[PDB]
Design a binder for these strands. Structure first.
Length: 1240
RNA sequence: AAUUUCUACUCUUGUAGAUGUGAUAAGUGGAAUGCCAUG
DNA sequence: CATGGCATTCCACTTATCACTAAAAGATCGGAAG
DNA sequence: CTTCCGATCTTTTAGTGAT
């Protein structure tokens, strides 16, 4: 028997807290006199400007090392293909093994242990390889091994700035250490060139050979384009797509060349571009040949390879030089404008335009690749003047039309022919547009230019002027000025001259675009160091004179004290713990052993002395220093810790591979005895009690023992320290003291502290001191950021502040990582069938809506979350989005929307968890991958809502409640754990702890009462013939004289061409055209039954506005127009098909589509509602207007109800799932079968 | 109109809710501009 | 009035690793012994 | 006085986890 409160203290989580530091007294002065702010800023400046120097060494050794790699890829390809053939598990582990094998073989070159190379170069590579991740870089020791990077003296002087400070790069050391590891990390060289680029190359090989065997004609094309691109000149175009050629393509340059081969070199602007492989293949597919139909039947795009890590860009395509400063761009543009003006380009341009009215118009030609732009700009469609010329050339005449379009679309056409086919209205539109363009250009030239562009309006005016400029250029480039056909010599000469005169605006335009779109600089914080190499790396009392960080607690307040190096050295400053009665500070005492698995072998078995001693002789060795008693080390123990093999005999890999569990158990028992002896005899840990441990042979796994052991090591005490001593240490300058501070520690606050502040209070709670649930962690940094009743707006940026970041770990007593968490959740839900369900849906009126249901599907509660603390957030969302797109072409700042995002989502989250703890339910969300929405719904931007899952996940990872008692479940010391750690959206299945994921569609459109939804697709019916075929596909239709409603009876296996193809649970349907009489709700307001809302599409191609409809009244008006008698209950179906005019058929189709339109909404009038045309088995026409709380209130409420029902189905299957597993989503047919089944 | 930071309010010189930092790397998507084609 | 494939720049986003460290080991430096 | 030696300060390091 497990209970809901049992889901706590399951696994550790790690959080970071941020605080502002207030200096206390003279320490603010004394930090300035040492000037550590400027020194640290200079240090950090040296760091980021020296970082690109360092990785050049990494790049150089990577390129040198990889060029010797030579491997067969046949086995890896075979494994990949075999796993592709069928996705059984043992092939997956086979492919995993092959991937690890290839990764290790590639890493062998890096370590210098590869077999294929000789021993001298192997030892050379090893001698290099040990030097990358040490201080050998900074003194240039490894530079002697390379002699290739060849830094200048300024770089060497930069390297001299970090003498005796190499620990600053430890994080960078680890970051680059992830690179050269065969450990399947996504950010690693061998994982990239094994699992990322190589499958792409293999499939590119296979699609190439399929293209070759499909048609051999493009083999000539491919060799031709290789010769044109001039890349890989020493190999065949077949051989490059062969597996042995992947012995190249490891360095960046070959990757770049391959990508250029796929894409093609881009020349400078205004020039023809050399096409690539994908481009020529797309040109082949765009010819609409039967061969293209053969190609369209095949995959038809190569895939570029991923970029090699740490390298740079070395493309052959043209790179435009970028601008530097505002004054540069404005002076360049001012002088360009004055040059253009003094060149009098406008006057000769005007002379060029009016010349057209007094020239032989057939003697001037227009480029065939620009005429469609002119047709679009001067008519309602691009195809207007194209079809005009097409039908003119047709009119002056099967294959003849082909020759006409061939001669038309490719050849440049004289202007007189254009005028003859077009008409003088296009001439007047042309002269109007040219007048507008010349007016814009003249105004832009007359308009001066601002003194900078940091304001948006300056960017606007320059963008407008330069925009008019390249618009004029686009106007100028319309004319086919080439002399292949006739062209007027003086006119062409003046046109070419003026185009060359005003040419470089386009380059000016792109350079201005690149300069203005740069993100503006803002001031940043940087890490403080106080000349401490290891400032606050850890808190331990032994290291506290080296890490230099000491905490104090004073009557509720918190103080962090830093002592610096005095006269360039660590003066041993210490204090005396006085009585608790004495006034003063309470110093924290950090007694901590980091981890048994790393420290015990370090201080015990992997010392230099023991390794030397036991290499010489087999005699056991006694260790004395840092031990109260001489510690025995046996040969056997060293053999277990140093097995000359990957699996240690006490560790579980030995058990998994070997299988001899006896030796595994005995080695484990011996190891536990040894580490118990070590913990007994070691100086730091001899004072700790370990009586809570089980005896040695009872333990199951070593990791279990370690996870048991680690919480015993960590321990905090507190000692009162006299106040005047601390004051004297501060006044001497020997102690820098800050107060840890946030909003909540201010005196003017009352009630509801911030959650992080509540964590901080809970860390130092005496109960947490008794047993450690909240553990303070190491590696804390300090940041300095410079500067940037009536209250001052933006007060917190006015002056410089000292920031403080500190990591803490929650649920310390729990295990390191969760295991079988979903299994535990499924077990609890199996034991509790009575658990409620909460459904979430994204509405159109509401941003989000919630529904609470039981196991019986009864609505406990629905509620609007559209407004929280009486605010409409969708309004601000749409204003911010419209300013985003308005600033997009405006060359403005990009900005962010995500603060308003998470501000609304936080209140949503808080309401969600309040409901969750109140109801002890589960929560169902829609799968983000299996759906699509747009602006018709409120919040539904896919990027917006997908991110909303994330804070839900980690808030449910370590959920606490601010008003709970700290010792209670849901308090600080017992956080609720309900989910697992989020990794990636594509990673988790349908279940994440108590959360559940279901397919989005077929949720809102269904009637809740019986499970009816329209099965008919309506884009099928385009003509009255299809509409007639649709209306004949019906069973029986008659009018109820008693109820005054029109009754349609429908069966499956009819209109299957118009169905959506998903069968329902029952084959019978009885649609009722409800009479549009008045009806009343639960409250008493009248409403019209069957009322529908419909957009306007009367113009047959566009969408209008919304309007009302009364289908029964319009229906009876239609039959009175047709004069067909229907007050008899007779079959109206033969009577309707008698009148075969397309208008009548279209009207009845529209009416029955409208009554099949389940969703009814118009926010302009404010009516969002659901009316079911299909009546109940009780005969009740369902409406959401009835306001029954038993049924959903609104349409989005209906969707939330239905997604809750989907979750109910999924967990009911879990109840039937005896394997404790879950389905891979929910099939739509299964869903509608289920909902129709229990509804009917 | 305040905040470690962010959001919403403003009486409270504050309120309520959220808030894993740092470093590194890669990828994706937009937009603009050119080039070649197609409807 | 758009689409397809490319190329350059700029911006935005996600995604995917590592650390959450006391002590050994080694460098080095200032003051007494030969 | 230089060499050495013991103090002292950076720098690297140690490695678990399912029938």
């Amino acid at each position: 028997m497990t209970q809901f409160e049992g889901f706590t203290n399951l696994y550790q989580v790690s959080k970071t807290l941020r605080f502002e530091l207030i200096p206390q007294g003279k320490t603010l002065k004394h930090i300035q006199e040492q000037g550590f702010i400027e020194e640290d800023k200079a240090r950090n400046d040296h760091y980021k400007e020296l970082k690109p120097i360092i990785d050049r060494i990494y790049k150089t050794y990577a390129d040198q090392c990889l060029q010797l790699v030579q491997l067969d890829w046949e086995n890896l390809s075979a494994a990949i293909d075999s796993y592709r053939k069928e996705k059984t598990e043992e092939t997956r582990n086979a492919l995993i093994e092959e991937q690890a094998t290839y990764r290790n073989a590639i890493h062998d070159y890096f370590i210098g242990r590869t077999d294929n190379l000789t021993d001298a170069i192997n030892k050379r590579h090893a001698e290099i390889y040990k030097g990358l991740f040490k201080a050998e870089l900074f003194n240039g020791k490894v530079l002697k091994q390379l002699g290739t990077v060849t830094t200048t003296e300024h770089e060497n002087a930069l390297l001299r700035s970090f003498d005796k400070f190499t620990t600053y790069f430890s994080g960078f050391y680890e970051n680059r250490k992830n690179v050269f590891s065969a450990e399947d990390i996504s950010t690693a060289i061998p994982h990239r060139i094994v699992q990322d680029n190589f499958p792409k190359f293999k499939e590119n090989c296979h699609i190439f050979t399929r293209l070759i065997t499909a048609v051999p004609s493009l083999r000539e094309h491919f060799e031709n384009v290789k010769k044109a691109i001039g890349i890989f000149v020493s190999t065949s175009i077949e051989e490059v797509f062969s597996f042995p050629f992947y012995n190249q393509l490891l360095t960046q340059t070959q990757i770049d060349l391959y990508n250029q081969l796929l894409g093609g070199i881009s020349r400078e602007a205004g020039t023809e571009k050399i096409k690539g492989l994908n481009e020529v293949l797309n040109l082949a597919i765009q010819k609409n040949d039967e061969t293209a139909h053969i190609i369209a039947s095949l995959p038809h795009r190569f895939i570029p390879l991923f970029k090699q890590i740490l390298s740079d860009r070395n493309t052959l395509s043209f790179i435009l030089e970028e601008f530097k400063s505002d004054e540069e761009v404005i002076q360049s543009f001012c002088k360009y404008k004055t040059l253009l003006r003094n060149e009098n380009v406008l006057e000769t341009a005007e002379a060029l335009f009016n010349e057209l009215n007094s020239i032989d118009l057939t003697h001037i030609f227009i480029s065939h690749k620009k005429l469609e732009t002119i047709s679009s700009a001067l008519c309602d469609h691009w195809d207007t003047l194209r079809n005009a010329l097409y039908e003119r050339r047709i009119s002056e005449l099967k294959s003849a039309k082909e020759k006409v379009q061939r001669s038309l679309k490719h050849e440049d056409i004289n202007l007189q022919e254009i005028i003859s086919a077009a008409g003088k209205e296009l001439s007047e539109a042309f002269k109007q547009k040219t007048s507008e363009i010349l007016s814009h250009a003249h105004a832009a030239l007359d308009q001066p230019l601002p003194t900078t562009l940091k304001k948006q309006e300056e960017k606007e005016i320059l963008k407008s002027q330069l925009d008019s400029l390249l618009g004029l250029y686009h106007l100028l480039d319309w004319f086919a000025v080439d002399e292949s056909n006739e062209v007027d010599p003086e006119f062409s000469a003046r046109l070419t001259g003026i185009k060359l005169e005003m040419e470089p605006s386009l380059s000016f335009y792109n350079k201005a675009r690149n300069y203005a779109t740069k993100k503006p600089y803002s001031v940043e914080k940087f890490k403080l160091n106080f000349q401490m190499p290891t400032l606050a790396s850890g808190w331990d009392v032994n290291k506290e004179k080296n890490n230099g960080a000491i905490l104090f607690v004073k009557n509720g307040l918190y103080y962090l004290g830093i002592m610096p190096k005095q006269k360039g050295r660590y003066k041993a400053l210490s204090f005396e713990p006085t009585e608790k009665t004495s006034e003063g500070f309470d110093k924290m005492y950090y007694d901590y052993f980091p981890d048994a698995a790393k420290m015990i072998p370090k201080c015990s078995t992997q010392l230099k002395a023991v390794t030397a001693h036991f290499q010489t002789h087999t005699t056991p060795i006694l260790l004395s220093n840092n031990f109260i008693e001489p510690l025995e080390i046996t040969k056997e123990i060293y053999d277990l810790n140093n097995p000359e093999k990957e699996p240690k005999k006490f560790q579980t890999a030995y058990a998994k591979k070997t299988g001899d569990q006896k030796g595994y158990r005995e080695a484990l028992c011996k190891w536990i005895d040894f580490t118990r002896d070590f913990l007994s005899k070691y100086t730091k840990t001899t004072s700790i009690d370990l009586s809570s441990l089980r005896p040695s042979s009872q333990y199951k796994d070593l990791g279990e023992y370690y996870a048991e052991l680690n919480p015993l090591l960590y321990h905090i005490s507190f000692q009162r320290i006299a106040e005047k001593e601390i004051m004297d240490a501060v006044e001497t300058g020997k102690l820098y003291l800050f107060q840890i501070y946030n909003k909540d520690f201010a005196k003017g606050h009352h009630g509801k502290p911030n959650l992080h502040t509540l964590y901080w209070t809970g860390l130092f709670s005496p109960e947490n001191l008794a047993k450690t649930s909240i553990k303070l962690n190491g590696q804390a940094e300090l940041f300095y950021r410079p500067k940037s009743h009536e209250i001052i707006k933006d007060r917190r940026f006015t002056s410089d502040k000292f920031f403080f970041h500190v990591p803490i770990t929650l649920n310390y007593q729990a295990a390191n990582s969760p295991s079988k968490f979903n299994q535990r959740v499924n077990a609890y839900l199996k034991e509790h069938p009575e658990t409620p369900i909460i459904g979430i849906d994204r509405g159109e009126r509401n941003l989000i809506y919630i529904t609470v249901i039981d196991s019986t599907g009864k609505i406990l509660e629905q509620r609007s979350l559209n407004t929280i603390q009486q605010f409409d957030y969708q309004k601000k969302l749409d204003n911010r989005e419209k300013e985003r797109v308005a600033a997009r072409q405006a060359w403005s700042v990009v900005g962010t929307i995500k603060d308003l995002k998470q501000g609304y989502l936080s209140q949503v989250i808080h309401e969600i968890v309040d409901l969750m703890i109140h109801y002890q339910a589960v929560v169902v969300l829609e799968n983000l991958n299996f759906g699509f929405k747009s602006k018709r719904t409120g919040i539904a931007e896919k990027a917006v809502y997908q991110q909303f899952e994330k804070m839900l996940i980690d808030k449910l990872n370590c959920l606490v409640l601010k008003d709970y008692p700290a010792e209670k479940v849901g308090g600080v010391l017992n956080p609720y754990q309900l989910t697992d750690q989020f990794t990636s959206f594509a990673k988790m299945g349908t279940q994440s702890g108590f959360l559940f994921y279901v397919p989005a569609p077929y949720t809102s459109k269904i009637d809740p009462l019986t499970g009816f939804v329209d099965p008919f697709v309506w884009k099928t019916i385009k003509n009255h013939e299809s509409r007639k075929h649709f209306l004949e596909g019906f069973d029986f239709l008659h009018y109820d004289v008693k109820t005054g409603d029109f009754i349609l009876h429908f069966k499956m296996n009819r209109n299957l061409s118009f169905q959506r193809g998903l069968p329902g649970f029952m084959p019978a349907w009885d649609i009722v055209f409800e009479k549009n009489e008045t009806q009343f709700d639960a409250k008493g307001t009248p409403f019209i039954a069957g009322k529908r809302i419909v957009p306007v599409i009367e113009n047959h191609r566009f969408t209008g506005r919304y309007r009302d409809l009364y289908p029964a009244n319009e229906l009876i008006a239609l039959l009175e127009e047709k004069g067909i008698v229907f007050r008899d209950g007779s079959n109206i179906l033969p009577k309707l098909l008698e009148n075969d005019d397309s208008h009548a058929i279209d009207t009845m189709v529209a009416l029955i589509r409208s009554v099949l339109q389940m969703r009814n909404s118009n926010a302009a009038t404010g009516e969002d509602y659901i009316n079911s045309p299909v009546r109940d088995l009780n005969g009740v026409c369902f409406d959401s207007r009835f306001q029954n709380p038993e049924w959903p209130m609104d349409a989005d409420a209906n969707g939330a109800y239905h997604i809750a029902l989907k979750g109910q189905l999924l967990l009911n299957h879990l109840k039937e799932s005896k394997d404790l597993k879950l389905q891979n989503g929910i099939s739509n047919q299964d869903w509608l079968a289920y909902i129709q089944e229990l509804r009917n």
